[PDB]
Design a protein around this ligand. Structure first.
Ligand code: HEM
Length: 152
């Protein structure tokens, strides 16, 4: 990415950082409504049925913060993220078994929620920069998955 593209990514991300849990809820709810098979991966809360149940769930709220905390740390490295990807790839490839296509699905949900919440900070320039950042994440985590023997 260019330095300007990185700055656009980090600009909108600072808006996420104002309420990380609420953004995480919205992104996971979007993911699970759009791609219900992904909910099955979360044993603690895979039985949730309605949007209201999802919003009330403490476990789902914790999960959203876990994801966004880790992704924010990755984005702030501006591509220089091998050390942060290493433990993530280890668990996601060998324990949770999250295929790349699920990482595509959550990327779509992140983009949807950022555009819904922050359109004036998420125009075409910024959306393209975030798309590039999230594609770089997925490309590099895929390479690390294969190093670990996982072809997902
Ligand atoms: C931006 C993408 C993602 C990030 C940064 C992320 C990050 C994290 C982190 C930091 C943890 C806790 C430590 C660990 O187990 O490694 C975790 C756990 C987990 N992740 Fe992810 N993750 C992402 C995408 C996903 C997706 C798309 C799924 C499912 C479709 C998923 C399923 C899980 C599961 C099942 C756990 C174990 C805990 C639980 O059941 O809530 N991850 N992830």
């Amino acid at each position: 990415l260019s330095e300007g593209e990185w700055q656009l990514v980090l600009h909108v991300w600072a808006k996420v950082e104002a309420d990380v849990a609420g953004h995480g809820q919205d992104i996971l709810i979007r993911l699970f409504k759009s791609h219900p098979e992904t909910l099955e991966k979360h044993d603690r809360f895979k039985h949730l049925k309605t949007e209201a149940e999802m919003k009330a769930s403490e476990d789902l709220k914790k999960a959203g913060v876990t994801v966004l905390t880790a992704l924010g740390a990755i984005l702030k490295k501006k591509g220089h993220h091998e050390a942060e990807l290493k433990p993530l790839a280890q668990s996601h490839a060998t324990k949770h078994k999250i295929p790349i296509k699920y990482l595509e699905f959550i990327s779509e949900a992140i983009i949807h929620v950022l555009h819904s919440r922050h359109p004036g900070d998420f125009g075409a320039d910024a959306q393209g920069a975030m798309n590039k950042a999230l594609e770089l994440f997925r490309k590099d985590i895929a390479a690390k998955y294969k190093e670990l023997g996982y072809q997902g």
